[PDB]
PDB file of N, CA and C in Angstrom:
ATOM      1  N   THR A   1      18.965  -4.227  25.140  1.00 43.74           N
ATOM      2  CA  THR A   1      18.069  -5.131  25.347  1.00 43.74           C
ATOM      3  C   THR A   1      17.091  -5.408  24.123  1.00 43.74           C
ATOM      4  N   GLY A   2      18.038  -4.988  22.660  1.00 41.00           N
ATOM      5  CA  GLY A   2      16.983  -5.841  21.536  1.00 41.00           C
ATOM      6  C   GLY A   2      16.043  -5.186  20.963  1.00 41.00           C
ATOM      7  N   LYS A   3      15.427  -4.750  20.240  1.00 39.86           N
ATOM      8  CA  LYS A   3      14.357  -4.101  19.399  1.00 39.86           C
ATOM      9  C   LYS A   3      13.371  -4.597  19.752  1.00 39.86           C
ATOM     10  N   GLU A   4      12.689  -3.291  19.897  1.00 40.89           N
ATOM     11  CA  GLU A   4      11.372  -3.011  20.163  1.00 40.89           C
ATOM     12  C   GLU A   4      10.089  -3.905  19.035  1.00 40.89           C
ATOM     13  N   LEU A   5       9.272  -4.601  19.512  1.00 39.05           N
ATOM     14  CA  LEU A   5       8.547  -5.041  18.420  1.00 39.05           C
ATOM     15  C   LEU A   5       6.915  -4.279  18.370  1.00 39.05           C
ATOM     16  N   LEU A   6       6.251  -4.027  16.923  1.00 42.31           N
ATOM     17  CA  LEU A   6       4.988  -3.057  17.099  1.00 42.31           C
ATOM     18  C   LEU A   6       4.160  -4.279  16.295  1.00 42.31           C
ATOM     19  N   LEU A   7       3.371  -4.080  16.655  1.00 40.60           N
ATOM     20  CA  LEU A   7       1.763  -4.406  15.797  1.00 40.60           C
ATOM     21  C   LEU A   7       1.429  -3.849  14.903  1.00 40.60           C
ATOM     22  N   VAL A   8       0.752  -3.085  13.673  1.00 41.19           N
ATOM     23  CA  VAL A   8       0.874  -2.969  12.701  1.00 41.19           C
ATOM     24  C   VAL A   8      -1.254  -3.070  12.552  1.00 41.19           C
ATOM     25  N   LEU A   9      -1.470  -1.903  12.854  1.00 41.46           N
ATOM     26  CA  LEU A   9      -2.799  -1.465  12.667  1.00 41.46           C
ATOM     27  C   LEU A   9      -3.859  -1.258  11.940  1.00 41.46           C
ATOM     28  N   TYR A  10      -2.907  -1.166  10.381  1.00 36.66           N
ATOM     29  CA  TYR A  10      -3.440  -1.178   9.629  1.00 36.66           C
ATOM     30  C   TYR A  10      -2.776  -0.647   8.266  1.00 36.66           C
ATOM     31  N   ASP A  11      -3.330  -1.944   6.884  1.00 35.34           N
ATOM     32  CA  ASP A  11      -2.497  -1.665   5.748  1.00 35.34           C
ATOM     33  C   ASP A  11      -1.823  -0.560   5.183  1.00 35.34           C
ATOM     34  N   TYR A  12      -0.641  -0.333   4.769  1.00 35.50           N
ATOM     35  CA  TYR A  12      -0.098   0.856   4.564  1.00 35.50           C
ATOM     36  C   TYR A  12       1.092   0.420   3.277  1.00 35.50           C
ATOM     37  N   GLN A  13       0.624   1.356   2.057  1.00 36.46           N
ATOM     38  CA  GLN A  13       1.341   1.093   0.995  1.00 36.46           C
ATOM     39  C   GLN A  13       2.863   1.878   0.924  1.00 36.46           C
ATOM     40  N   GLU A  14       4.240   1.635   0.671  1.00 36.67           N
ATOM     41  CA  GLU A  14       4.626   3.062   0.493  1.00 36.67           C
ATOM     42  C   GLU A  14       4.315   3.635  -0.290  1.00 36.67           C
ATOM     43  N   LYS A  15       4.602   5.191  -0.197  1.00 35.19           N
ATOM     44  CA  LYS A  15       4.439   6.257  -1.051  1.00 35.19           C
ATOM     45  C   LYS A  15       5.598   7.241  -1.096  1.00 35.19           C
ATOM     46  N   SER A  16       6.518   7.067  -1.037  1.00 32.31           N
ATOM     47  CA  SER A  16       7.660   7.918  -1.732  1.00 32.31           C
ATOM     48  C   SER A  16       9.054   6.529  -1.397  1.00 32.31           C
ATOM     49  N   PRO A  17       9.892   6.763  -1.641  1.00 32.85           N
ATOM     50  CA  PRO A  17      11.172   5.922  -1.561  1.00 32.85           C
ATOM     51  C   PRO A  17      11.437   5.623   0.142  1.00 32.85           C
ATOM     52  N   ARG A  18      11.631   6.715   1.029  1.00 33.38           N
ATOM     53  CA  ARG A  18      11.750   6.407   2.455  1.00 33.38           C
ATOM     54  C   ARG A  18      10.914   5.082   3.057  1.00 33.38           C
ATOM     55  N   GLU A  19       9.654   5.232   3.121  1.00 30.23           N
ATOM     56  CA  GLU A  19       8.473   4.642   3.096  1.00 30.23           C
ATOM     57  C   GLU A  19       8.975   3.090   2.896  1.00 30.23           C
ATOM     58  N   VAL A  20       7.965   2.163   3.820  1.00 27.07           N
ATOM     59  CA  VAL A  20       7.948   0.755   3.310  1.00 27.07           C
ATOM     60  C   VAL A  20       6.259   0.179   3.530  1.00 27.07           C
ATOM     61  N   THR A  21       5.961  -0.739   3.035  1.00 26.04           N
ATOM     62  CA  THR A  21       5.096  -0.705   3.202  1.00 26.04           C
ATOM     63  C   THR A  21       4.397  -1.838   4.166  1.00 26.04           C
ATOM     64  N   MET A  22       3.692  -2.444   4.494  1.00 29.67           N
ATOM     65  CA  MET A  22       2.905  -2.974   6.030  1.00 29.67           C
ATOM     66  C   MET A  22       1.716  -3.154   5.618  1.00 29.67           C
ATOM     67  N   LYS A  23       1.431  -4.167   6.678  1.00 29.11           N
ATOM     68  CA  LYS A  23       0.179  -5.384   6.485  1.00 29.11           C
ATOM     69  C   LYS A  23      -1.106  -4.782   7.689  1.00 29.11           C
ATOM     70  N   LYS A  24      -2.106  -5.262   7.514  1.00 31.50           N
ATOM     71  CA  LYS A  24      -2.160  -4.917   9.305  1.00 31.50           C
ATOM     72  C   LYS A  24      -1.983  -5.872  10.090  1.00 31.50           C
ATOM     73  N   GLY A  25      -1.926  -6.260  10.800  1.00 31.38           N
ATOM     74  CA  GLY A  25      -1.398  -7.662  12.203  1.00 31.38           C
ATOM     75  C   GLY A  25      -0.057  -7.820  12.150  1.00 31.38           C
ATOM     76  N   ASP A  26       0.902  -7.901  10.995  1.00 31.03           N
ATOM     77  CA  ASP A  26       2.128  -7.713  10.664  1.00 31.03           C
ATOM     78  C   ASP A  26       2.798  -7.388  12.388  1.00 31.03           C
ATOM     79  N   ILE A  27       3.970  -7.794  12.555  1.00 30.54           N
ATOM     80  CA  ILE A  27       4.628  -7.265  13.282  1.00 30.54           C
ATOM     81  C   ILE A  27       6.124  -7.262  13.235  1.00 30.54           C
ATOM     82  N   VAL A  28       6.392  -6.246  13.477  1.00 32.72           N
ATOM     83  CA  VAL A  28       7.555  -5.070  12.679  1.00 32.72           C
ATOM     84  C   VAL A  28       8.206  -5.033  13.801  1.00 32.72           C
ATOM     85  N   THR A  29       9.229  -4.385  13.518  1.00 32.18           N
ATOM     86  CA  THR A  29      10.712  -4.209  14.419  1.00 32.18           C
ATOM     87  C   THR A  29      10.833  -2.283  14.333  1.00 32.18           C
ATOM     88  N   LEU A  30      10.760  -1.859  15.789  1.00 27.31           N
ATOM     89  CA  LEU A  30      10.811  -0.855  15.674  1.00 27.31           C
ATOM     90  C   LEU A  30      12.523  -0.144  16.006  1.00 27.31           C
ATOM     91  N   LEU A  31      12.601   0.844  14.910  1.00 30.52           N
ATOM     92  CA  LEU A  31      14.369   1.281  14.363  1.00 30.52           C
ATOM     93  C   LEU A  31      14.825   2.510  15.155  1.00 30.52           C
ATOM     94  N   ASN A  32      13.584   3.217  15.167  1.00 26.92           N
ATOM     95  CA  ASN A  32      13.413   4.861  14.684  1.00 26.92           C
ATOM     96  C   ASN A  32      12.178   5.309  15.402  1.00 26.92           C
ATOM     97  N   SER A  33      12.447   5.813  16.926  1.00 26.79           N
ATOM     98  CA  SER A  33      11.052   6.329  16.929  1.00 26.79           C
ATOM     99  C   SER A  33      10.963   8.087  17.431  1.00 26.79           C
ATOM    100  N   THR A  34      12.662   8.873  16.910  1.00 27.97           N
ATOM    101  CA  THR A  34      12.588   9.887  17.296  1.00 27.97           C
ATOM    102  C   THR A  34      11.399  10.650  16.457  1.00 27.97           C
ATOM    103  N   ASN A  35      11.622  11.000  15.816  1.00 31.05           N
ATOM    104  CA  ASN A  35       9.773  11.336  15.296  1.00 31.05           C
ATOM    105  C   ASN A  35       9.016  11.312  15.311  1.00 31.05           C
ATOM    106  N   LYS A  36       7.665  11.734  16.069  1.00 30.14           N
ATOM    107  CA  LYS A  36       6.868  11.799  16.462  1.00 30.14           C
ATOM    108  C   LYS A  36       5.332  11.611  15.772  1.00 30.14           C
ATOM    109  N   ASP A  37       5.776  11.855  14.441  1.00 33.02           N
ATOM    110  CA  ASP A  37       5.039  11.126  13.506  1.00 33.02           C
ATOM    111  C   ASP A  37       5.538  10.072  12.168  1.00 33.02           C
ATOM    112  N   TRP A  38       6.997  10.108  12.355  1.00 31.86           N
ATOM    113  CA  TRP A  38       7.124   8.982  10.859  1.00 31.86           C
ATOM    114  C   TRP A  38       8.479   8.161  11.783  1.00 31.86           C
ATOM    115  N   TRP A  39       8.173   7.104  12.169  1.00 32.83           N
ATOM    116  CA  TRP A  39       9.046   5.860  12.834  1.00 32.83           C
ATOM    117  C   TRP A  39       9.038   5.405  11.969  1.00 32.83           C
ATOM    118  N   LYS A  40      10.670   4.851  11.956  1.00 31.10           N
ATOM    119  CA  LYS A  40      11.237   3.931  11.573  1.00 31.10           C
ATOM    120  C   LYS A  40      11.394   2.275  11.577  1.00 31.10           C
ATOM    121  N   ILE A  41      10.952   1.163  10.308  1.00 29.53           N
ATOM    122  CA  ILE A  41      10.389   0.306  11.078  1.00 29.53           C
ATOM    123  C   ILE A  41      11.427  -0.643  10.284  1.00 29.53           C
ATOM    124  N   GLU A  42      11.474  -2.348  10.101  1.00 27.39           N
ATOM    125  CA  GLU A  42      12.211  -3.430   9.573  1.00 27.39           C
ATOM    126  C   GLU A  42      10.393  -4.222   9.797  1.00 27.39           C
ATOM    127  N   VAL A  43      10.669  -4.424   8.518  1.00 24.20           N
ATOM    128  CA  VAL A  43       9.286  -5.568   8.105  1.00 24.20           C
ATOM    129  C   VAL A  43      10.275  -6.452   7.177  1.00 24.20           C
ATOM    130  N   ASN A  44      10.548  -7.968   7.402  1.00 23.73           N
ATOM    131  CA  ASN A  44      11.087  -8.000   6.770  1.00 23.73           C
ATOM    132  C   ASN A  44      12.579  -8.460   6.350  1.00 23.73           C
ATOM    133  N   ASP A  45      13.257  -7.914   4.855  1.00 27.37           N
ATOM    134  CA  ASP A  45      13.983  -7.931   4.427  1.00 27.37           C
ATOM    135  C   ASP A  45      14.449  -6.286   4.136  1.00 27.37           C
ATOM    136  N   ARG A  46      12.439  -5.715   4.490  1.00 29.85           N
ATOM    137  CA  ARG A  46      12.684  -4.392   4.569  1.00 29.85           C
ATOM    138  C   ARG A  46      12.496  -3.297   5.211  1.00 29.85           C
ATOM    139  N   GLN A  47      13.313  -2.199   5.245  1.00 27.96           N
ATOM    140  CA  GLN A  47      13.471  -1.325   6.197  1.00 27.96           C
ATOM    141  C   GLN A  47      12.486   0.228   5.603  1.00 27.96           C
ATOM    142  N   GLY A  48      12.226   1.405   6.310  1.00 29.15           N
ATOM    143  CA  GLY A  48      11.671   2.356   6.371  1.00 29.15           C
ATOM    144  C   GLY A  48      10.484   2.932   7.424  1.00 29.15           C
ATOM    145  N   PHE A  49      10.506   4.192   6.565  1.00 28.96           N
ATOM    146  CA  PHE A  49       9.486   5.056   7.429  1.00 28.96           C
ATOM    147  C   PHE A  49       7.812   5.053   7.432  1.00 28.96           C
ATOM    148  N   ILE A  50       7.317   4.311   7.720  1.00 24.54           N
ATOM    149  CA  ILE A  50       6.105   4.786   8.054  1.00 24.54           C
ATOM    150  C   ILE A  50       4.872   5.330   9.490  1.00 24.54           C
ATOM    151  N   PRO A  51       3.675   6.092   9.216  1.00 29.21           N
ATOM    152  CA  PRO A  51       2.963   7.129  10.190  1.00 29.21           C
ATOM    153  C   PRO A  51       3.419   6.179  11.200  1.00 29.21           C
ATOM    154  N   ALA A  52       3.432   6.552  12.681  1.00 27.97           N
ATOM    155  CA  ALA A  52       3.313   5.733  14.130  1.00 27.97           C
ATOM    156  C   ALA A  52       2.086   6.044  14.127  1.00 27.97           C
ATOM    157  N   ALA A  53       1.279   6.793  14.178  1.00 25.26           N
ATOM    158  CA  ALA A  53       0.377   6.515  14.536  1.00 25.26           C
ATOM    159  C   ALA A  53      -0.173   5.065  13.951  1.00 25.26           C
ATOM    160  N   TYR A  54       0.221   4.570  12.760  1.00 25.90           N
ATOM    161  CA  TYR A  54      -0.427   3.084  12.150  1.00 25.90           C
ATOM    162  C   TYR A  54      -0.188   1.558  13.364  1.00 25.90           C
ATOM    163  N   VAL A  55       0.998   2.362  13.818  1.00 27.98           N
ATOM    164  CA  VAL A  55       1.986   1.103  14.841  1.00 27.98           C
ATOM    165  C   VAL A  55       1.714   1.253  16.629  1.00 27.98           C
ATOM    166  N   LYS A  56       1.139  -0.098  16.892  1.00 30.83           N
ATOM    167  CA  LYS A  56       1.618   0.497  18.393  1.00 30.83           C
ATOM    168  C   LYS A  56       2.674  -0.629  19.077  1.00 30.83           C
ATOM    169  N   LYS A  57       3.319   0.133  19.758  1.00 33.66           N
ATOM    170  CA  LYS A  57       4.668  -0.477  20.779  1.00 33.66           C
ATOM    171  C   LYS A  57       3.412  -1.743  21.959  1.00 33.66           C
ATOM    172  N   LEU A  58       4.181  -2.819  21.556  1.00 33.36           N
ATOM    173  CA  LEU A  58       4.021  -4.121  22.004  1.00 33.36           C
ATOM    174  C   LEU A  58       5.142  -4.342  22.936  1.00 33.36           C
ATOM    175  N   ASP A  59       5.314  -3.394  24.354  1.00 34.86           N
ATOM    176  CA  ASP A  59       5.623  -3.150  26.058  1.00 34.86           C
ATOM    177  C   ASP A  59       6.405  -4.635  26.185  1.00 34.86           C
TER     178      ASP A  59
END
């Protein structure tokens, strides 16, 4: 039933090639939450990892 949306809690600039930048208040798509520390998301045309603590699932 489609990928889950998350709310971005904090602005975050990518710090490595695998990461992605996001802005507070963005609604991003969860791609992979298997890691407890880093989740893979889609933020429009871009995808990458961010700190799991900095996003909240919109169940």
